[PDB]
Amino acid sequence: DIAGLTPCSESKAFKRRENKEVKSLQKRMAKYEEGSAPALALQATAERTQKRFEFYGKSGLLCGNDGLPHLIADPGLAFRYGHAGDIMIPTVLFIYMAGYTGYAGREYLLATRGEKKPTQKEIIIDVPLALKCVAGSAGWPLRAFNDLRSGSLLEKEENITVS
Amino acid sequence: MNAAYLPSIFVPLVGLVFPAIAMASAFLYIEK
Amino acid sequence: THIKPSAQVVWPIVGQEILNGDVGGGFQGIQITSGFFQLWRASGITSELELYSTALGGLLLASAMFFAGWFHYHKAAPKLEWFQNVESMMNHHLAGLLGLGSLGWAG
Amino acid sequence: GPKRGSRVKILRPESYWYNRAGKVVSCDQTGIKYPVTVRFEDVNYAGVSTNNFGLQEVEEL
Amino acid sequence: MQNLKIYLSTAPVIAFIWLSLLSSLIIEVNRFFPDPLIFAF
Amino acid sequence: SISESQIFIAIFLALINGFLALRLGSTLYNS
Amino acid sequence: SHNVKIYDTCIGCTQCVRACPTDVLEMVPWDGCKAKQIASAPRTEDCVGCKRCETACPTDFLSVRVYLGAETTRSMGLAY
Amino acid sequence: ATKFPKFSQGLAQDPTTRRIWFGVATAHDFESHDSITEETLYQKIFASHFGQLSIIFLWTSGNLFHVAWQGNFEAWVQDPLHIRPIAHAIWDPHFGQSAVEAFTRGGASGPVNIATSGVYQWWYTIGMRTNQDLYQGSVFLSIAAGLFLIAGWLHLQPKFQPTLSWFKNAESRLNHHLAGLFGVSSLAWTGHLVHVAIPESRGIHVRWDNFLTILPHPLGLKPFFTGNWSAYAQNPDTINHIFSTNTGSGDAILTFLGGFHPQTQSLWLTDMAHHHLAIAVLFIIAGHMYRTNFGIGHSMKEILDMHTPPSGNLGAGHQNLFDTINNSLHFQLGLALASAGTICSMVAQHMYSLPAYAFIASDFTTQASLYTHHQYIAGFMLCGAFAHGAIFFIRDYDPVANKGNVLARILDHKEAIISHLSWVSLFLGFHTLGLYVHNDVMLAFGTPEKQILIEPVFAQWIQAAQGKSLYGFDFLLASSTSPAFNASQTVWLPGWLDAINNPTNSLFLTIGPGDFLVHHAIALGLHTTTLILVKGALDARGSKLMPDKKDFGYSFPCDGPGRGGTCDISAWDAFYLSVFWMLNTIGWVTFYWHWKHLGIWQGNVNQFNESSTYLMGWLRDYLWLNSSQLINGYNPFGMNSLSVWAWMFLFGHLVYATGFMFLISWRGYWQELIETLAWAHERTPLANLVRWKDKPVALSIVQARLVGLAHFSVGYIFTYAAFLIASTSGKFG
Ligand SMILES: CCCCCCCCCCCCCCCCCC(=O)OC[C@H](CO[C@@H]1O[C@H](CO[C@H]2O[C@H](CO)[C@H](O)[C@H](O)[C@H]2O)[C@H](O)[C@H](O)[C@H]1O)OC(=O)CCCCCCCCCCCCCCCCC
Ligand code: CLA
Ligand code: CLA
Ligand code: CLA
Ligand code: CLA
Ligand code: CLA
């Protein structure tokens, strides 16, 4: 299909790749009589591993010749051809994960800025003031636009330069 | 190749002799 | 002569339980190069109960040291003259630690 | 000219406080080349928190 | 208790405590929801 | 297969390219 | 011989002159200073290049700046 | 000045050996001497170019002459595939009976070097087929070079010494170098192709004897002058055409069929004859652009000065640049290396995939030894393009006349450029390494199914536009419908779609997950190399720490351990750090090129795209298998024919490892050590009588780093030069 790939469920080497692991695993657990937890621990992993195979085959990942599932970047490809969960969705997740801690770091420096000596306030955090920021940081996309358009996000031209 | 005796003549001259002279003369010119 | 030494055991999560090697005695864990097992045989330690008794006793006397550490700085701290006695200190370390500590072990 | 305690911005090209606010600790009434003395909460590379400037450079805000 | 808090508010303490709250959480998310390659569920 | 005669012709021809450098390098360093 | 030159910015703190291990910088009296004192470098001969001067200047950007020139028997500090 | 460094009296008088060391390394810097006027500075330069230009020719006449004399040619010409080209013989007084014999591999009697240079085919695909031709050719370059050493001597005398403003006339050079140097040469070269190479490709011997008795084409110039130009293109060769003979040989001269020449698996010659003949016509037209004595043309400056955009986004735009450029040499040299540097690489990108010469991509190891040459030699040239970019800003840049220019706008924002390169280089830093590590762990714990693998979508779709049909796309040349395939269907599509779809030739190798992850490392290496160099240029003037660097010199050790202990504060030390990255981002390339090809030369695509993702395959597969052949050279059981490289590969490390002694251990330690020795030698008996003139001293700060980075590179090159050659010479792909 896409890019000369095939869905991993209808792949073949992928099916080798799944059923070659259990063999090497089970031939190993034949050395432990069931009265041993190692007989159970190995068993539980073989059943744990097969779950993910039926998951990867189902979810529709694309395995190339090797049988290993690949991904696809472009929105116009992921979206239209149906699998965007590889990056396109989690690339939104991350930004909200990263910007949240990103923007929660900016407010704290603002709130702790005006004082007698902000320095000791950076070493020793007052967690309540940091908590009020961790709370306030949520919905940073809407709070970033506003510091952006109100003009309070940038520090403008009093920055220092050299020559 | 018909010239075969040349390398035995040159290589020692260019691997030793010239580096012997260019070692001496280039030295004496460092201090005057 | 067969079983290889092992202590550390790896929790199953994150697909890392493969680190547990098939070793011996129906067990899965990391190899040991430290050499505790081949000491504990030479100390005449057989059951697991001797080990718990050292673990606790070792962890108990450890707590006695930090109290000694607290006690000899904050509470009762020797003076300079006390640390200036080498010949006492050397009589004791050489006889007390090494002299008695060898007999005790020779016993 | 400029007065003590009032905030300042510094346009001196070579400086660690160039375009950075500072508070005058003292201004001399004299003919000194560099009469005004400012003070900055920030620290220089040298560890210097104070410096003398010229009237042409210091500007009060 | 005054001064015990201020110490617990030092930089390396929170750096330890708060990462060990992520680390633990991110570890256990993988305990119940194992092997998450793509967001498909 | 190159004739032994040609060989010395070339080596002598490259011998002149040794003097024209010495004449250059002098005049250049002498400046 | 190294070059050392001094600028308007001096406060006359003498903190340079105390630094020089060869005692190059020597305080010359002056007028426009707050303390009415200015350093100066009569010997560019014996500046070794330590730049212990430039570390000592309390001035924001230095009143002394050592410009390393060529290096002689003295300015290499040779015992040989 | 009496003593050795005659050109500077600061060095001329030094009691120590630093007079000696700098005397060598300060030589070629002509802006710094006793008194160098503007006129006499251009003099020594323009004389020196005669030096470089003459040195090259002799170097070529050597290659020609040796192959003509100590090497085999005819025997190779007969069997290009099944026999090895030979280079100069191995003369060592040091050998045993075994190593002599083991190195006599070839057609010759004595021990010789199989020549991996690659020059040996470019003679045959131009075509010669006698050792006489090589000797005949090796004499000219000896003669011709003699003309410059004459010219070099000839232009330094007062009479023929050219005036300064002769050098600064930039509209005459361009007109000449474009049309005369570039263009006219391209004519002559198609002249050579049509008259010599192409007929000799079909097995017709033409030399300076029979040259003008034999038509290159059956027609005359009738078709050329009537205006009818499809005759020359009318009768191309056959697919089964056998090279250097006449079998089904087409009659055409100027054609292009695209694709290769399946016997030689190289480019069609008529296709090249058509090429240069077009380039000849372009330059010759483009050399009349700039004005000369005849008053018709353009003025360089009044082209520029009208380009300030009518907004002010660029402010004054290009204004007084033709001042800075035509005055600053280093500015002109920064462009020269940057322009020529990239092309060196561009050569290497095309020349493996489009193997112009006949019967390369057959013998493999002469591609590897080349592609790496032109990547490294392209690396150094760019790192020098930025250095002289810094020497520009540190010295001959003027902020006054440039006020509001485009150069001054960049210095106005230094950080933006510096800061964003610092973001891109970190992004590629964490994520590219972060994936290799993730892929490693997943394959360590035994499930590769968990790996992060991304398919390089774009460069796949780019190859789809190119028309590689292995993918599912069909846009432009891939789709027979698109208004592209229909346009070129008549000319270069039919051939060039065979070469791209016949997965033997390396044209557009199929890409994949390993291909994806590497191109980001490559992309990483390009940014952090620029990030360093772009910094050293913009901070050459000054930074917040030391804003004197404009007046403190260019290359200086430091400002001393004040105000935070400045070290490497200069702009030379900034460049100094680029080389270390230059040698990675080139090392990553030349690795990634080698081991993608190894699998393809060895007939398997699965060694790479399987194990290419995780970093162990690079170590476990590419490094481990290749090393087995190299280390057996010096084997105590006997000498292999790779024992040459087995030794050097060790010589490569020991220099690299020596290089750390200079980079790590700094001076003050060694200066106190020499003190103890100059005391011992001084007060010891029988050595009292023998003493030094120049008092020994631990060499200068900057001197060591320079010496240090030399060892680092010389060692970095010889290992990979030995590993590459002796891996493909041991296996033969
Ligand atoms: C190509 C080699 C030929 C073929 C090989 C032959 C074997 C090589 C044997 C080595 C022979 C040379 C050894 C040189 C060591 C000395 C280097 C040194 O102390 O040199 C340091 C000098 C010292 O700097 C100069 O130092 C000068 C010192 O001042 C002097 O100059 C002042 C300027 O007027 C005044 O005159 C003053 O009186 C006087 O003191 C000034 O400071 C100059 O401004 C400053 O530039 O630095 C310089 O200028 C730097 C100039 C070098 C830049 C090139 C560096 C490139 C690094 C190599 C790249 C890796 C290559 C690996 C290749 C591997 C593949 C095979
Ligand atoms: C939370 C505060 C904060 C914020 C808002 C930023 C924001 C920024 N940094 Mg940054 N940085 C920070 C902390 C922060 N940084 C710290 C603590 C360090 C190291 C000690 C750095 C080191 C750093 C470098 C070296 C670079 C940046 C860059 C950047 C810019 C691009 C973003 C990026 O890719 O960074 C990527 C971030 C990193 C590589 C490291 C960040 C590591 C985390 C985020 C620091 C921990 C945050 C802190 C614990 C939050 C406490 C919250 C609590 C008190 C309430 C952006 C302006 C880049 C730049 O200028 O490009 C424009 C750049 O080159 N920063
Ligand atoms: C028989 C008498 C005796 C003994 C056994 C020791 C034993 C020891 N002394 Mg010591 N000491 C003594 C007399 C003695 N001292 C006297 C009289 C002086 C005065 C000059 C000192 C002054 C002195 C100094 C200044 C230092 C020591 C240190 C040490 C320890 C050696 C470091 C080490 O590896 O320990 C190995 C540890 C073990 C083998 C574990 C056994 C430890 C247990 C608790 C036995 C300790 C007995 C000890 C005598 C205390 C008993 C009295 C107390 C319980 C009331 C060791 C515990 C060093 C040390 O560790 O400081 C804390 C050290 O720096 N001693
Ligand atoms: C037609 C007239 C003409 C011609 C032929 C030349 C020719 C030359 N001049 Mg020149 N000059 C002229 C007029 C001319 N000039 C005039 C009128 C002036 C006064 C304004 C000057 C002023 C002048 C100066 C001041 C200097 C020169 C220099 C040079 C030399 C440059 C080095 C060189 O050849 O690069 C070799 C490069 C090529 C032959 C082509 C390179 C093209 C690109 C880079 C690559 C293309 C090749 C191909 C793709 C690669 C494959 C190669 C193959 C082996 C595989 C060259 C001999 C310089 C020199 O060397 O000093 C003598 C120099 O310093 N000239
Ligand atoms: C045509 C290209 C070209 C030209 C004309 C110049 C010209 C110049 N460069 Mg320059 N440069 C170039 C390319 C070029 N460079 C490239 C490609 C780089 C990057 C590597 C540099 C990096 C560079 C730096 C960093 C500096 C210069 C400097 C200079 C000036 C003085 C050079 C000097 O003193 O050398 C004199 C001769 C030597 C120093 C010879 C030293 C030998 C070197 C170290 C190589 C040793 C390794 C050797 C090959 C190993 C042999 C292996 C074997 C034993 C097995 C001069 C204007 C210097 C300058 O202007 O400072 C003010 C300076 O500091 N250049
Ligand atoms: C393998 C060795 C190595 C590595 C990894 C780096 C990495 C880096 N160099 Mg560097 N460098 C090196 C060798 C190396 N260099 C050498 C030999 C030289 C010659 C002197 C230089 C010279 C040099 C210069 C001159 C410059 C750099 C720059 C950079 C940065 C480029 C951006 C990047 O890729 O970030 C990727 C970053 C990483 C891969 C760091 C990985 C560490 C992980 C992600 C975090 C820690 C892991 C773990 C949590 C630690 C646990 C520890 C334990 C106590 C808990 C980066 C930090 C440039 C820079 O500043 O960039 C902004 C720059 O200007 N370097």
Ligand SMILES: CC1=CCCC(C)(C)[C@H]1/C=C/C(C)=C/C=C/C(C)=C/C=C/C=C(C)/C=C/C=C(C)/C=C/C1=C(C)CCCC1(C)C
């Ligand atoms: C730092 C320094 C000191 C002071 C002055 C100085 C100018 C020297 C300054 C600059 C130094 C240097 C070396 C700067 C830049 C170096 C570099 C990396 C130059 C490379 C530029 C690359 C360029 C354009 C590529 C442009 C686009 C290309 C090919 C592709 C075109 C095309 C595409 C993409 C598809 C095929 C067909 C078509 C349309 C032709």
Ligand code: SF4
């Ligand atoms: S130079 Fe710096 S230190 Fe020496 S006197 Fe002037 S100000 Fe005080």
